[PDB]
Amino acid sequence: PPTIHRNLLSPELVQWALKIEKDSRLTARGALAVMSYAKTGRSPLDKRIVDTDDVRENVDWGKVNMKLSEESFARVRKIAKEFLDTREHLFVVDCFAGHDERYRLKVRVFTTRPYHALFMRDMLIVPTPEELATFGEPDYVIYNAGECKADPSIPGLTSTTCVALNFKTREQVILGTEYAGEMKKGILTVMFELMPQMNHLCMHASANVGKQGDVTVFFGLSGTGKTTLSADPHRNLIGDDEHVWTDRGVFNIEGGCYAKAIGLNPKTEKDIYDAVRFGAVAENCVLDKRTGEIDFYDESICKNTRVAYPLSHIEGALSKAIAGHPKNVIFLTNDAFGVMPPVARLTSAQAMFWFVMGYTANVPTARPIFSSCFGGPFLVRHATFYGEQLAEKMQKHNSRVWLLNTGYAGGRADRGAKRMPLRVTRAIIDAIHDGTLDRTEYEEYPGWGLHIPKYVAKVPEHLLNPRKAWKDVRQFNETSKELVAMFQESFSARFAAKASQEMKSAVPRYVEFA
Amino acid sequence: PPTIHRNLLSPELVQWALKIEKDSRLTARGALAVMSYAKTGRSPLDKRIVDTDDVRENVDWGKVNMKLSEESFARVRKIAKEFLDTREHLFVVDCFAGHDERYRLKVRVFTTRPYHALFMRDMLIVPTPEELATFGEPDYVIYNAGECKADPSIPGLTSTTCVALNFKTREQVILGTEYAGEMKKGILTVMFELMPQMNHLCMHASANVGKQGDVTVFFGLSGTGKTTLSADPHRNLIGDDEHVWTDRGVFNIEGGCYAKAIGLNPKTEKDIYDAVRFGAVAENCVLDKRTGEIDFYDESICKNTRVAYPLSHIEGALSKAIAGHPKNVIFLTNDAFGVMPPVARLTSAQAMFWFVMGYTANVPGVEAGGTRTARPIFSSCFGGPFLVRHATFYGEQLAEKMQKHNSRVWLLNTGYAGGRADRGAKRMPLRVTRAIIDAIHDGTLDRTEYEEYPGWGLHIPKYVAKVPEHLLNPRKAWKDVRQFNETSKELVAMFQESFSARFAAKASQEMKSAVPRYVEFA
């Protein structure tokens, strides 16, 4: 029978990783460096939601949410359980998803790899000794048999990889993938269905709070600014990736951060760099033979290197990650075309439109994409469901909505354009937080109809209006026309049929610059 | 036969310790927690200095320094090297002892236990890659075959434990003890002979420097305040245990700190407590089952729990641990009788007397075969177990140094007050001692009026900021004056006996006048 290790301490898990994970080792600072092998990212094509009666009607079935019969799920679960039950060592992690006790979920994770256990210990909330002793029945159970292949001949499967979520039995089965993110995003997906049931708004956004208690959330796909922008010298971090907006305010779903490790350095990201020490995990990163230090710029393994660390590793981060109702709501658009404004103040109507449209770009040359609510791969309900929730929330709490371009400026990424200066974006955020941006004068950005500021402290005027940043006005009109067309097609395919009056009027139009 | 691992990185050594050291593990913060087993302290009774012509005439042979024939040293050395050569893994650590480059020693350490290697990597100075490439032949070699028993029948030995130092061949052999301190104190012993040869003063004291560059040294045996008091929020740490006073100032012999771990906590000693993390070692400490953090109050294994960390783990510690000439010289006396004043400013005459007399306490654990309770002791120059020359030799060096540099000498009671420890008295509040040191460094204590503490003849302050007046004079602190008189009388007799047995015959008139006398307070 397997030797079962229940809720081991971080140092104990590190010890186990070093012993049974062939390629795992310690960095000069004590972080646990490991590799996930074959899969170094999510496998959306292999994600499934079991087709159970309790949720079938609410699940937005399509490219992201794909059905799996209960019979097939039973088959993959059996494969996963038999694999787990036949390992020499089994690791169990009991934790909570959510910092607000009134809404948190009890989760139990079974892993075969010690680093996956450490990851979950770091990424979710660790229960107290008393809570563990009285944990009872978990709400959700994750069977991470990722080191084991699935049977691709099972009806519904398309490969040896399978990440299936059953809302009826409250179970996640992972096969054929050791990428730790699959567990974390599986929990996010669970939250994207349970919160709607409780009428709360799950958000694929980071968040922080100012000294005066003003909360700001930043929506966006991974690698588009959530982690770096929420890390503010003058603001306490609440979380860098996933939050829920309730009647009481917001709460971080996680107990840690799974940040992209690319380019981490003590100069421009001191706090995060310093967090990559003992107790933390380095996933698919390469270490320098000489010093045993991680080469954060080395992507020879993959372009999705990661580090995972508890929230406690970030100075200023809230011990209990909960805070008030968002004063400022930010949409991060990683615009590869370079036509989106550094910042635009959205009206209530535009907020709705831009939120559900989710225009941004996925990182690995940055591919443009429309991702519902800036979290398309994890949504369970239709984009409109969440859009309506946000509209109601922001209206009730008088939240200010902003659109920030974290992509390119002056041209197209595929033509060698330069990225929107991080310094400019931060300057804009400070202006949002200082209250000046909300009081300055605005001008309309033609065609798009976006309201851009005429002036912003520390920010160049030629940047505020994208048109001014482009050398060739002809190329600007051509690119703008192309993107507008993309917005129109996306909208016509996704929301037109049931769109409201305000929505249709928010669809951008092409206005050639005379 | 063995796979030899040379100059590994800290993470590599930790990995090795976890793999081959059965009872080793990591603490909640990443420190390598290990056990030294049978020996959890030094074995002074098993310490030996080889009887070689080059040092025989200078070594103060006696109860501390005991001869070992060159032939017998060859025997233990053979046993050691044989053991080392037959292990599956051998660890080598090349390093420097001494931050002053004109006096530093190249040391090569051979160990079988990975933690002993990590220990020395932390405790001595790590050479630059360039220096390692041109390291060449080491000046001294330590063969730590501590996991292997010695042949007790070997002439000169009295047990299966042997810690021998040969100044001629420049080697230390360790057998029958896995206590890491044996290596550290071996190098200290070497310095206590090599420095005298260059007429520099080796000191069993910690040291730190102020913003203005003023250096302070604190003499004392382990567990009497050297580490605690040198870790000052307002001053940069130089070292916590071993320094040398040269013609240019002072230099730390070590590259880390081997601190007593008993009672460490983030409340009163945050800096030291925070240093116990990845890269550091915890020796004979017990971890809290549910927290994984060291239970710094647990002495179930021994009362000499330790932690070892690089000086780099202490914020503000000097990278190159060297500074100027001590402006203030402090003698720490862990007085269990509660009769020593919290602070006394010593005259030049008293300074020499108190230095060689070395009255303090021998805390439990540090050395083998002790009682779970602290015992008053007279340890020459506050470093008796490690001295090579006679106490008087070092005393004369200090007198000349302090005179030349106008150093101010202070005596601090880091033990008990208001009564005897064995009668339930409370220890000297750390707050008081810290306030006193602040007054020494602010220059106010040197400017206050002093009064004479009768019999002892010690000059005590009439006032010190943040210090209750009734504590400045031990007498006023005791509840029963009769009990105070009887205890002071007992301790005075102990001083007189020690002085007469050790220095009286050849003592100068000035030294003899420093001898305390009993004056009943009526």
Curated annotation (Swiss-Prot), chain A:
The keyword Lyase applies. Its main location: other. This is Phosphoenolpyruvate carboxykinase (ATP), glycosomal. The keyword Membrane does not apply. Keywords: ATP-binding, Decarboxylase, Gluconeogenesis, Glycosome, Lyase, Nucleotide-binding, Peroxisome. Belongs to the phosphoenolpyruvate carboxykinase (ATP) family. GO terms for biological process: gluconeogenesis. Gene3D superfamilies: 3.90.228.20, Phosphoenolpyruvate Carboxykinase, domain 1, Phosphoenolpyruvate Carboxykinase, domain 2. Homodimer. It is found in: Glycosome. It catalyses: oxaloacetate + ATP = phosphoenolpyruvate + ADP + CO2. InterPro entries: PEP_carboxykinase_ATP (IPR001272), PEP_carboxykinase_C (IPR013035), PEP_carboxykinase_N (IPR008210), PEPCK_ATP_CS (IPR015994). The lineage of its organism: Eukaryota, Discoba, Euglenozoa, Kinetoplastea, Metakinetoplastina.
Curated annotation (Swiss-Prot), chain B:
One of its GO terms (molecular function) is ATP binding. It is an enzyme of class 4 (lyase). Keywords: ATP-binding, Decarboxylase, Gluconeogenesis, Glycosome, Lyase, Nucleotide-binding, Peroxisome. The keyword Lyase applies. ATP binds at G220, L221, S222, G223, T224, G225, K226, T227. InterPro entries: PEP_carboxykinase_ATP, PEP_carboxykinase_C, PEP_carboxykinase_N, PEPCK_ATP_CS. It is found in: Glycosome. GO terms for biological process: gluconeogenesis. Its main location: other. Pathway: Carbohydrate biosynthesis; gluconeogenesis. It catalyses: oxaloacetate + ATP = phosphoenolpyruvate + ADP + CO2. GO terms for cellular component: cytosol; glycosome. Its EC number is 4.1.1.49. The keyword Lyase applies. PANTHER family: PHOSPHOENOLPYRUVATE CARBOXYKINASE (ATP), PHOSPHOENOLPYRUVATE CARBOXYKINASE ATP. Belongs to the phosphoenolpyruvate carboxykinase (ATP) family. Homodimer. This is Phosphoenolpyruvate carboxykinase (ATP), glycosomal. The lineage of its organism: Eukaryota, Discoba, Euglenozoa, Kinetoplastea, Metakinetoplastina.
